[PDB]
Design a protein around this motif. Structure first.
Motif, PDB file in Angstrom:
ATOM      1  N   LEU A 144     -28.549  -8.038   8.186  1.00 52.54           N
ATOM      2  CA  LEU A 144     -27.650  -9.066   8.694  1.00 52.54           C
ATOM      3  C   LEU A 144     -28.060 -10.470   8.287  1.00 52.54           C
ATOM      4  N   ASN A 145     -29.288 -10.652   7.797  1.00 52.22           N
ATOM      5  CA  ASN A 145     -29.722 -11.968   7.360  1.00 52.22           C
ATOM      6  C   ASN A 145     -29.524 -12.203   5.871  1.00 52.22           C
ATOM      7  N   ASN A 146     -29.179 -11.175   5.102  1.00 51.54           N
ATOM      8  CA  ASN A 146     -29.045 -11.335   3.658  1.00 51.54           C
ATOM      9  C   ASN A 146     -27.711 -11.995   3.344  1.00 51.54           C
ATOM     10  N   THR A 182     -17.525  -2.547   9.633  1.00 50.66           N
ATOM     11  CA  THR A 182     -18.696  -2.076   8.897  1.00 50.66           C
ATOM     12  C   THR A 182     -19.707  -3.216   8.803  1.00 50.66           C
ATOM     13  N   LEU A 183     -20.861  -3.005   9.338  1.00 43.42           N
ATOM     14  CA  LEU A 183     -21.914  -4.005   9.314  1.00 43.42           C
ATOM     15  C   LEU A 183     -22.784  -3.829   8.081  1.00 43.42           C
ATOM     16  N   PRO A 184     -23.288  -4.904   7.492  1.00 45.80           N
ATOM     17  CA  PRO A 184     -24.416  -4.739   6.572  1.00 45.80           C
ATOM     18  C   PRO A 184     -25.651  -4.349   7.367  1.00 45.80           C
ATOM     19  N   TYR A 216       0.845  -1.182   0.000  1.00 39.95           N
ATOM     20  CA  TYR A 216       0.000   0.000   0.000  1.00 39.95           C
ATOM     21  C   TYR A 216       0.885   1.239   0.000  1.00 39.95           C
ATOM     22  N   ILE A 217       0.528   2.228  -0.815  1.00 37.65           N
ATOM     23  CA  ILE A 217       1.360   3.437  -0.928  1.00 37.65           C
ATOM     24  C   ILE A 217       1.506   4.084   0.447  1.00 37.65           C
ATOM     25  N   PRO A 218       2.717   4.431   0.887  1.00 38.55           N
ATOM     26  CA  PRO A 218       2.852   5.138   2.165  1.00 38.55           C
ATOM     27  C   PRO A 218       2.142   6.482   2.098  1.00 38.55           C
ATOM     28  N   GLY A 219       1.529   6.880   3.210  1.00 39.16           N
ATOM     29  CA  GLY A 219       0.827   8.148   3.248  1.00 39.16           C
ATOM     30  C   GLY A 219      -0.568   8.149   2.649  1.00 39.16           C
ATOM     31  N   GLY A 220      -1.029   7.045   2.044  1.00 40.58           N
ATOM     32  CA  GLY A 220      -2.369   6.985   1.502  1.00 40.58           C
ATOM     33  C   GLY A 220      -3.343   6.224   2.396  1.00 40.58           C
ATOM     34  N   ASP A 221      -4.634   6.489   2.205  1.00 38.81           N
ATOM     35  CA  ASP A 221      -5.648   5.678   2.854  1.00 38.81           C
ATOM     36  C   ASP A 221      -5.670   4.274   2.258  1.00 38.81           C
ATOM     37  N   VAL A 222      -6.145   3.326   3.058  1.00 40.65           N
ATOM     38  CA  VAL A 222      -6.200   1.916   2.699  1.00 40.65           C
ATOM     39  C   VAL A 222      -7.623   1.435   2.920  1.00 40.65           C
ATOM     40  N   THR A 223      -8.232   0.895   1.875  1.00 38.58           N
ATOM     41  CA  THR A 223      -9.501   0.210   1.995  1.00 38.58           C
ATOM     42  C   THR A 223      -9.249  -1.272   2.209  1.00 38.58           C
ATOM     43  N   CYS A 224      -9.885  -1.820   3.229  1.00 39.00           N
ATOM     44  CA  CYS A 224      -9.807  -3.235   3.545  1.00 39.00           C
ATOM     45  C   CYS A 224     -11.146  -3.870   3.187  1.00 39.00           C
ATOM     46  N   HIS A 225     -11.125  -4.843   2.288  1.00 36.24           N
ATOM     47  CA  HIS A 225     -12.335  -5.514   1.832  1.00 36.24           C
ATOM     48  C   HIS A 225     -12.414  -6.870   2.510  1.00 36.24           C
ATOM     49  N   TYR A 226     -13.558  -7.174   3.120  1.00 39.18           N
ATOM     50  CA  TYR A 226     -13.717  -8.473   3.757  1.00 39.18           C
ATOM     51  C   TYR A 226     -15.083  -9.052   3.403  1.00 39.18           C
ATOM     52  N   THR A 227     -15.213 -10.370   3.567  1.00 37.76           N
ATOM     53  CA  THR A 227     -16.455 -11.088   3.304  1.00 37.76           C
ATOM     54  C   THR A 227     -16.769 -11.940   4.515  1.00 37.76           C
ATOM     55  N   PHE A 228     -17.973 -11.785   5.075  1.00 41.17           N
ATOM     56  CA  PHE A 228     -18.405 -12.714   6.108  1.00 41.17           C
ATOM     57  C   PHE A 228     -18.821 -14.015   5.448  1.00 41.17           C
ATOM     58  N   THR A 229     -18.425 -15.133   6.048  1.00 47.00           N
ATOM     59  CA  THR A 229     -18.940 -16.399   5.564  1.00 47.00           C
ATOM     60  C   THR A 229     -20.435 -16.523   5.886  1.00 47.00           C
ATOM     61  N   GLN A 230     -21.037 -17.560   5.299  1.00 49.63           N
ATOM     62  CA  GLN A 230     -22.487 -17.723   5.252  1.00 49.63           C
ATOM     63  C   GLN A 230     -23.154 -17.523   6.608  1.00 49.63           C
ATOM     64  N   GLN A 278     -20.318  -8.938   1.727  1.00 51.40           N
ATOM     65  CA  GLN A 278     -19.057  -8.289   1.373  1.00 51.40           C
ATOM     66  C   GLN A 278     -19.113  -6.832   1.811  1.00 51.40           C
ATOM     67  N   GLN A 279     -18.153  -6.452   2.623  1.00 55.68           N
ATOM     68  CA  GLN A 279     -18.104  -5.134   3.210  1.00 55.68           C
ATOM     69  C   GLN A 279     -16.682  -4.637   3.065  1.00 55.68           C
ATOM     70  N   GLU A 280     -16.454  -3.439   3.585  1.00 61.93           N
ATOM     71  CA  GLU A 280     -15.136  -2.838   3.575  1.00 61.93           C
ATOM     72  C   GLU A 280     -15.069  -1.837   4.711  1.00 61.93           C
ATOM     73  N   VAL A 281     -13.847  -1.536   5.118  1.00 59.98           N
ATOM     74  CA  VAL A 281     -13.583  -0.530   6.128  1.00 59.98           C
ATOM     75  C   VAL A 281     -12.393   0.273   5.616  1.00 59.98           C
ATOM     76  N   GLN A 282     -12.311   1.554   5.986  1.00 61.93           N
ATOM     77  CA  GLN A 282     -11.260   2.413   5.444  1.00 61.93           C
ATOM     78  C   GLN A 282     -10.333   2.892   6.549  1.00 61.93           C
ATOM     79  N   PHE A 283      -9.047   2.569   6.413  1.00 60.71           N
ATOM     80  CA  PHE A 283      -8.020   3.039   7.331  1.00 60.71           C
ATOM     81  C   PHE A 283      -7.445   4.355   6.800  1.00 60.71           C
ATOM     82  N   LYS A 284      -7.519   5.416   7.601  1.00 62.90           N
ATOM     83  CA  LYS A 284      -6.946   6.692   7.186  1.00 62.90           C
ATOM     84  C   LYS A 284      -5.433   6.707   7.397  1.00 62.90           C
ATOM     85  N   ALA A 285      -4.733   7.326   6.437  1.00 65.68           N
ATOM     86  CA  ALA A 285      -3.271   7.387   6.425  1.00 65.68           C
ATOM     87  C   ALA A 285      -2.694   7.834   7.762  1.00 65.68           C
ATOM     88  N   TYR A 286      -3.333   8.822   8.404  1.00 65.06           N
ATOM     89  CA  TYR A 286      -2.874   9.348   9.690  1.00 65.06           C
ATOM     90  C   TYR A 286      -2.529   8.241  10.683  1.00 65.06           C
TER      91      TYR A 286
END
Lengths: 43, 110, 43, 109
Positions: free
Chosen positions: B65-67, B60-62, B16-30, B72-80
């Motif tokens: 929660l039953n769908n 980040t919650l959907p 990940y580029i230093p100094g940039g924000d990072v999006t983390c993508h995750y998927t909950f299993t069934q 698939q969700q994501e959370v954003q880490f700020k560079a700071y």
């Protein structure tokens, strides 16, 4: 006593060892390319 | 070891580029039920307990929660908050009981 | 037990990490040689 | 630090399959090897000392005070060695089952 931390490190170790293998494969190809260039340029 | 793979990290990059924000993508299993104070931490590889997180974001919650298709969700880490050394880090999903429910491949801020 | 287990894996991972670092540095030197030689086939 | 009382050295990245493997190690100043201590070859990521691929009883030193005799070796016979491409490491396990040292990893190729 949880083994989650060990699992996390296995996940990381597994990927770094795959990156090591690929990096060494690429270095082998770069050496071949160098040899070709040196045969062409240095006689 | 399916208990520590109940959350899957998607499309994690090696760098990940230093100094940039990072999006983390995750998927909950069934069948995995996320809770509001679950979190994604950034950990240096080799960490022993979840308290060694470098930084974190609450999950980040959907809203549905039953769908099964909204998993698939994501959370954003700020560079700071992010590292700027050459260490290897990974994402770990930690639920409210402190159990690691997923762990990513490592990456560097480079 | 799980502590020695984790320690032993950290030991493994730290060395495979170092090897990947050495491999990237050789990768970078090999590419520098290629670039030097390819320059000799532009002039 | 209790897992570092035995220090492995000269550990190769690769061991020739079909060749006996010499394992080199030293003891820290305090440590005393006992007759049923052993060194295992373990697949990296092992979870208990039960999981060794193979092992050897520690070589008992004939005098453990000499400065010209700190180097220790034990030999693993080729016919007990792994024959796949996994990463392995040495671990020293003492009589009580405590791991006293763990090596950097290697493959058999």
């Amino acid at each position: 006593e949880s083994v989650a931390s060990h699992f996390a490190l296995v996940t990381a170790y597994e990927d770094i060892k795959k990156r090591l293998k690929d990096s060494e494969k690429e270095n082998s190809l770069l050496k071949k390319r160098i040899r070709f260039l040196e045969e062409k340029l240095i006689a | 070891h399916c208990h520590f793979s109940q959350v899957i990290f998607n499309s994690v990059e090696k760098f990940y580029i230093p100094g940039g924000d990072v999006t983390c993508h995750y998927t909950f299993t069934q069948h995995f039920i996320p809770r509001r104070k679950d979190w994604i931490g950034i950990f240096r590889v080799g960490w022993k307990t979840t308290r060694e997180y470098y930084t974190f974001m609450w999950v980040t919650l959907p809203i549905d929660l039953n769908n099964k298709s909204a998993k698939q969700q994501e959370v954003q880490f700020k560079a700071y908050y992010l590292p700027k050394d050459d260490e290897y880090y990974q994402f770990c999903y930690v639920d409210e009981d402190g159990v690691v429910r997923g762990a990513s491949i490592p990456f560097q801020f480079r």
